Amino acid sequence: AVASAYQRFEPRAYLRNNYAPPRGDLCNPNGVGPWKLRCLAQTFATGEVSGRTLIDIGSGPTVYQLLSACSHFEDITMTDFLEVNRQELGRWLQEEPGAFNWSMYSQHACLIEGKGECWQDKERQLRARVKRVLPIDVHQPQPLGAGSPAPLPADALVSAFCLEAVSPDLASFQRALDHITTLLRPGGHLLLIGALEESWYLAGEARLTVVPVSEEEVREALVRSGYKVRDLRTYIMPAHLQTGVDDVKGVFFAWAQKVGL
């Protein structure tokens, strides 16, 4: 019944707690922002994660997870359980009034990528390759998509801070991973980002209860769902980024491959 709590979920409050200074201050490489974008950039740069279609699970109201990604997939599908978020994304996609400012992220994605690309061009490419923003439920065996417009099976998947924050225990987590794994074409690629050993986090009036997992549980979960863990790293949250919006211990990045056998 996490969904009950997600009802009071305030996108703007979420964005302010996680993507605005101090966490959203991308000057200083020892930060989470830099590190997350770095993991993403380095993985795609290997040019092994490629194709035509891509799906972002539980996008929430953020876009940074697709910045380096868009350069490799012409058809990008963003998703999220809450409508308030799907709406929040739209303000940025359609450049509506009061959309969130991802300038800094776009810029650092461009710095890290080193293609001499300007942020305006990248944001333009992301907004372009994002075809639709569909509603999704990782808890359903067929992720809120009975006959979804999304091209299936996707050639790759990306998820940042979703699963751990939607499931109440390690088992839900595992099943949710299985669910989404079904959307991934065999031999496909998965880029998983999430909170390590986190139990709760605020988002306005909402107070989400989440499953504290470990780099090892996640790895196992990945292997159990039928993946070849290509890369798995962990960033330890510094004291300075430990504000009172949650109790994260660290953050993990996972590059997994749907092993086709």
Ligand SMILES: Nc1ncnc2c1ncn2[C@@H]1O[C@H](CSCC[C@H](N)C(=O)O)[C@@H](O)[C@H]1O
């Ligand atoms: N059952 C469910 N299935 C999929 N997404 C869900 C869900 N229940 C809640 N969510 C959404 O999953 C998100 C997790 S937190 C936001 C994650 C975002 N990718 C980021 O990095 O900031 C929230 O936006 C929440 O509304």
Ligand SMILES: Ic1ccc2c(c1)CNCC2
């Ligand atoms: I750093 C970072 C980014 C996103 C989120 C958290 C921490 C903690 N709560 C889930 C959302």
